[PDB]
Structures are given as C-alpha cells and as structure tokens.
Scaffold this motif. Structure first.
Motif, PDB file in Angstrom:
ATOM      1  N   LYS A 172     -31.372 -51.034 141.013  1.00 18.95           N
ATOM      2  CA  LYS A 172     -32.389 -49.748 141.192  1.00 18.95           C
ATOM      3  C   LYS A 172     -32.803 -49.662 139.555  1.00 18.95           C
ATOM      4  O   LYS A 172     -33.859 -48.807 139.313  1.00 18.95           O
ATOM      5  CB  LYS A 172     -31.329 -48.542 140.835  1.00 18.95           C
ATOM      6  CG  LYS A 172     -30.773 -48.563 142.566  1.00 18.95           C
ATOM      7  CD  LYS A 172     -29.661 -47.465 142.752  1.00 18.95           C
ATOM      8  CE  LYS A 172     -29.269 -47.271 144.157  1.00 18.95           C
ATOM      9  NZ  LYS A 172     -28.332 -46.163 144.585  1.00 18.95           N
ATOM     10  N   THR A 173     -32.621 -50.422 138.489  1.00 17.11           N
ATOM     11  CA  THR A 173     -33.075 -50.431 137.144  1.00 17.11           C
ATOM     12  C   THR A 173     -33.658 -51.898 137.005  1.00 17.11           C
ATOM     13  O   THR A 173     -32.933 -52.895 137.231  1.00 17.11           O
ATOM     14  CB  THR A 173     -32.246 -49.858 136.223  1.00 17.11           C
ATOM     15  OG1 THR A 173     -31.169 -50.718 136.215  1.00 17.11           O
ATOM     16  CG2 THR A 173     -31.688 -48.431 137.026  1.00 17.11           C
ATOM     17  N   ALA A 174     -34.053 -51.739 135.825  1.00 16.88           N
ATOM     18  CA  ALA A 174     -34.669 -53.428 135.107  1.00 16.88           C
ATOM     19  C   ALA A 174     -33.140 -53.983 134.858  1.00 16.88           C
ATOM     20  O   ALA A 174     -33.163 -55.326 134.963  1.00 16.88           O
ATOM     21  CB  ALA A 174     -35.449 -53.128 134.068  1.00 16.88           C
ATOM     22  N   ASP A 175     -32.212 -53.142 134.369  1.00 14.53           N
ATOM     23  CA  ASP A 175     -30.988 -53.669 133.763  1.00 14.53           C
ATOM     24  C   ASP A 175     -30.323 -54.525 134.823  1.00 14.53           C
ATOM     25  O   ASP A 175     -29.414 -55.456 134.968  1.00 14.53           O
ATOM     26  CB  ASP A 175     -30.043 -52.919 132.797  1.00 14.53           C
ATOM     27  CG  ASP A 175     -30.773 -52.846 131.231  1.00 14.53           C
ATOM     28  OD1 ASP A 175     -31.499 -53.790 130.943  1.00 14.53           O
ATOM     29  OD2 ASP A 175     -30.241 -51.796 130.842  1.00 14.53           O
ATOM     30  N   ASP A 176     -30.087 -53.979 136.049  1.00 17.80           N
ATOM     31  CA  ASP A 176     -29.490 -54.324 137.408  1.00 17.80           C
ATOM     32  C   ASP A 176     -29.948 -55.674 137.819  1.00 17.80           C
ATOM     33  O   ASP A 176     -29.179 -56.430 138.405  1.00 17.80           O
ATOM     34  CB  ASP A 176     -29.891 -53.454 138.478  1.00 17.80           C
ATOM     35  CG  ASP A 176     -28.948 -52.019 138.386  1.00 17.80           C
ATOM     36  OD1 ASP A 176     -28.448 -51.849 137.693  1.00 17.80           O
ATOM     37  OD2 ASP A 176     -29.419 -51.091 139.391  1.00 17.80           O
ATOM     38  N   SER A 193     -40.840 -53.501 142.712  1.00 13.80           N
ATOM     39  CA  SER A 193     -41.140 -54.160 141.465  1.00 13.80           C
ATOM     40  C   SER A 193     -42.494 -54.648 141.303  1.00 13.80           C
ATOM     41  O   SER A 193     -43.214 -54.611 140.214  1.00 13.80           O
ATOM     42  CB  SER A 193     -40.271 -55.306 140.835  1.00 13.80           C
ATOM     43  OG  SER A 193     -40.100 -56.362 142.055  1.00 13.80           O
ATOM     44  N   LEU A 209     -39.151 -47.478 141.697  1.00 20.06           N
ATOM     45  CA  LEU A 209     -38.824 -47.452 140.090  1.00 20.06           C
ATOM     46  C   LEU A 209     -39.401 -46.346 139.447  1.00 20.06           C
ATOM     47  O   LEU A 209     -40.459 -45.870 139.775  1.00 20.06           O
ATOM     48  CB  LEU A 209     -39.250 -48.800 139.434  1.00 20.06           C
ATOM     49  CG  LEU A 209     -38.540 -50.082 140.050  1.00 20.06           C
ATOM     50  CD1 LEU A 209     -39.466 -51.384 139.799  1.00 20.06           C
ATOM     51  CD2 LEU A 209     -37.284 -50.217 139.612  1.00 20.06           C
ATOM     52  N   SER A 210     -38.399 -45.677 138.607  1.00 18.27           N
ATOM     53  CA  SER A 210     -38.984 -44.647 137.582  1.00 18.27           C
ATOM     54  C   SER A 210     -40.089 -45.500 136.823  1.00 18.27           C
ATOM     55  O   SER A 210     -40.091 -46.391 136.725  1.00 18.27           O
ATOM     56  CB  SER A 210     -37.812 -44.244 136.760  1.00 18.27           C
ATOM     57  OG  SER A 210     -37.307 -45.090 136.025  1.00 18.27           O
ATOM     58  N   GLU A 268     -39.990 -45.223 133.636  1.00 20.25           N
ATOM     59  CA  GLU A 268     -39.120 -45.957 132.567  1.00 20.25           C
ATOM     60  C   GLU A 268     -38.628 -47.419 132.873  1.00 20.25           C
ATOM     61  O   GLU A 268     -38.858 -48.233 131.911  1.00 20.25           O
ATOM     62  CB  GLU A 268     -37.949 -45.102 132.233  1.00 20.25           C
ATOM     63  CG  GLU A 268     -38.075 -43.541 131.761  1.00 20.25           C
ATOM     64  CD  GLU A 268     -38.328 -42.660 132.863  1.00 20.25           C
ATOM     65  OE1 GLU A 268     -38.673 -42.724 133.914  1.00 20.25           O
ATOM     66  OE2 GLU A 268     -37.972 -41.327 132.232  1.00 20.25           O
ATOM     67  N   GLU A 269     -38.407 -47.401 134.113  1.00 20.72           N
ATOM     68  CA  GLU A 269     -37.832 -48.859 134.420  1.00 20.72           C
ATOM     69  C   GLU A 269     -38.965 -49.590 134.696  1.00 20.72           C
ATOM     70  O   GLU A 269     -38.771 -50.723 134.510  1.00 20.72           O
ATOM     71  CB  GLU A 269     -37.148 -48.512 135.989  1.00 20.72           C
ATOM     72  CG  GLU A 269     -35.779 -48.016 135.440  1.00 20.72           C
ATOM     73  CD  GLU A 269     -34.710 -48.497 134.425  1.00 20.72           C
ATOM     74  OE1 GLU A 269     -34.969 -49.910 134.414  1.00 20.72           O
ATOM     75  OE2 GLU A 269     -34.390 -47.670 133.496  1.00 20.72           O
ATOM     76  N   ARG A 270     -40.157 -49.190 135.317  1.00 22.66           N
ATOM     77  CA  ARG A 270     -41.170 -50.165 135.565  1.00 22.66           C
ATOM     78  C   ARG A 270     -41.562 -50.591 134.212  1.00 22.66           C
ATOM     79  O   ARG A 270     -42.032 -51.662 133.798  1.00 22.66           O
ATOM     80  CB  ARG A 270     -42.467 -49.322 136.097  1.00 22.66           C
ATOM     81  CG  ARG A 270     -43.597 -50.369 136.455  1.00 22.66           C
ATOM     82  CD  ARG A 270     -44.626 -49.792 137.348  1.00 22.66           C
ATOM     83  NE  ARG A 270     -44.002 -49.237 138.829  1.00 22.66           N
ATOM     84  CZ  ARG A 270     -43.525 -50.080 139.734  1.00 22.66           C
ATOM     85  NH1 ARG A 270     -43.791 -51.519 139.768  1.00 22.66           N
ATOM     86  NH2 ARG A 270     -42.793 -49.768 140.789  1.00 22.66           N
ATOM     87  N   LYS A 322     -40.111 -50.971 131.555  1.00 28.19           N
ATOM     88  CA  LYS A 322     -39.031 -52.254 131.080  1.00 28.19           C
ATOM     89  C   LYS A 322     -39.618 -53.373 131.615  1.00 28.19           C
ATOM     90  O   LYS A 322     -39.396 -54.566 130.852  1.00 28.19           O
ATOM     91  CB  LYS A 322     -37.652 -51.759 131.129  1.00 28.19           C
ATOM     92  CG  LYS A 322     -37.176 -50.674 130.493  1.00 28.19           C
ATOM     93  CD  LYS A 322     -35.776 -49.999 130.868  1.00 28.19           C
ATOM     94  CE  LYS A 322     -35.349 -48.877 129.936  1.00 28.19           C
ATOM     95  NZ  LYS A 322     -34.205 -48.254 130.565  1.00 28.19           N
TER      96      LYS A 322
END
Length: 308
Positions: free
Chosen positions: A138-142, A209, A272-273, A275-277, A279
């Motif tokens: 769900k996030t770049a860290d995932d 993504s 993606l939010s 913020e995550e995009r 990243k």
C-alpha cells in the motif's frame, strides 16, 4: 499490380496491439482500393520480436513490430521510454501529440533511420504496476525486501533494486509457476496482461505504481519505404496514424476493464497517496543516471517536455 506488404509481430489474437494492426490492414486496403494489402503474421509466426525486427532492418521483411524494451537491442536510445516516472498517465495526450507531430517524433524518426527503419505506428502498450501474492502493498515501504520477478530489461532490474526489492529475472512462461511456488513474491505488469494471462488467480494485492511505460513500435524497412510511390507512402502513413487513434483509445478501455476485473476477483487495488507516489519517484530517480550515457540528454528532455 498489387503491392503485398508483410507485417510480423509477436502478439496474440484479440490483444490491444494485434487489433491495432488489424485496423491498419483494413485502412490500408480501403485507402488503396485494394491495391495495397498488408499480410499479418501475428503470434511470432515469422519468429521472435527480435528476429522479425532484424529482418525488417535488413530488408528480408517489409514491416515488424517490437516492444520498446526489445528495441533497445537495436539502439539503447529507445530506453528513454523505460526510465522510471519519465511519463505518467495524466499527461498521455500531450505525449502522443509529441510522438506523432512534434520534435520528439522527428528525433525518433532520425534514430530509426540510422538503424534502417521508418516508424509507422507507436502502438500503446501501457504502464506497469506492482502486484503481490501474499504481502499487502500500500506504501513505498511495503515494497522493501520483496522478491520480484523482472524481465531481462536493465532498467527493470535497477528499478527493483532502487526500491529495496530483490529482482529475479524469470521468463514470462515460468512466472506463474514461480509466483504459485513462492520463488518470487510479486511482479510488475499491466492489469490487462495480468488479467488476460489469469495471473489474477494467484495475486492478492496491486498498487497503481505506474513505474514503467512501454509501447509496441511498428517499423518498416526504410529502403523499402523509400522505394514506394508517394501516394502509397502517404496511405501507409495515414493508415498508421488513423489506426493509432483507435488503438490508443481501445487500450485505455481494456485497461479500465482489467482493473475492474481485479476488483471483481477480490484483489485489493490501492490508489497510492501523493506522499507515497513521491517516494517511488524520488527513490527511482537515481536509475536515470545509471543509463544516461546511452540515452541522449536531448531525447530525455523532449520526453520530459511532454509532462508539463
């Protein structure tokens, strides 16, 4: 007499690219009153993407279509299109116009001419998106520590490593087994292809993504093209441009339908939010530097100019 022109490509019946080529064939025969006939050789009937493109370059075949990543085998300049986040779906209309009408399209013609080719259609292929079998993303860290299938594309491998993932190059034919058996945790591809190949049966998560873009490039042998009467060259040119209008739109519609199919099959599709995009963009931007020696700054700039 009739002019018979062979067109080889690697794509299957009903595919967005295959159907653009059918429209092209139809339009050539209409505009020519039947004098010029495109004979389609889909599904690798004349060989792989690479073999049929080399035939087109050398003049033992009139036309062939190759994915933009495979075209990098003929000139690494074509990699400009694969660079992560060089383009985004938001700006696609301006991209098409530049490719078709603009300085960008002129520069690409120059590149094609230097390797013996004349571009006829830049068929839409689309954006790749990361998907997983079991690990929620769900996030770049995932994405960090994911074992992800890639193709052989240098950029694909570097993008994965830039995001903290462990790329494994695996051929397409082997990829479903690998996901099912757990040698990889996920992959990155279009919703259309993943749905059409039923990878959706093993996947559970997707993120939008859009981390890679590609096209399928229909090229004619330049010497052959140069040997044709002006009215035939114009028929081919116009037919390809007109076919492309439909093919681009059909591709968009199929991608929408595929995303719908993901949701109907229970796959969680995360938008993606901002913020995550941001990243993913910033983490992958260092890949461009790894490849800039083979990609002219001027060409990168032309593509970038389409996104503003």
């Amino acid at each position: 007499k009739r002019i018979n022109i062979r067109l080889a490509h690697p794509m299957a019946p009903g595919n967005n690219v295959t159907v653009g080529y059918e429209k092209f064939k139809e339009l050539v025969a209409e505009k020519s009153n039947g004098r010029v006939r495109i004979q389609l050789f889909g599904n690798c009937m004349l060989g792989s993407d690479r073999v049929t493109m080399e035939a087109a370059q050398r003049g033992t075949l009139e036309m062939a279509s190759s994915s933009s990543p495979n075209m990098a085998n003929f000139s690494k300049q074509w990699m400009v299109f694969d660079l992560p986040y060089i383009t985004s779906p938001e700006h696609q209309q301006k991209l098409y116009k530049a490719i078709d009408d603009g300085e960008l399209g002129k520069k690409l013609d120059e590149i094609a001419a230097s390797i013996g080719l004349k571009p006829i259609m830049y068929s839409e292929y689309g954006y790749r998106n990361f998907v997983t079998t079991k690990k929620p993303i769900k996030t770049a860290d995932d994405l960090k520590n994911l074992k992800v299938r890639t193709t052989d594309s240098p950029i694909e491998v570097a993008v994965a490593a830039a995001l903290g993932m462990a790329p494994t190059p695996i051929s397409w034919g082997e990829t479903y087994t690998a996901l099912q058996q757990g040698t990889v945790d996920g992959e990155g591809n279009t919703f259309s292809l993943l749905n059409d190949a039923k990878h959706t049966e093993v996947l559970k998560y997707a993120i939008d993504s859009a981390h890679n873009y590609s096209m399928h490039l229909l090229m004619m042998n330049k010497a052959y093209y140069d040997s044709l009467p002006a009215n035939v060259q114009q028929i081919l040119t116009e037919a390809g441009r007109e076919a492309l209008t439909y093919q681009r739109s059909i591709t968009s519609e199929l991608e929408k339908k595929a995303e719908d199919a993901f949701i109907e099959q229970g796959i969680t599709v995360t938008r993606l939010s901002p913020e995550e995009r941001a990243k993913l963009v910033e983490r992958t931007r260092p890949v461009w530097d790894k490849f800039k020696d083979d990609i002219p700054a001027e060409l990168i700039k032309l593509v970038q100019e389409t996104q503003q």
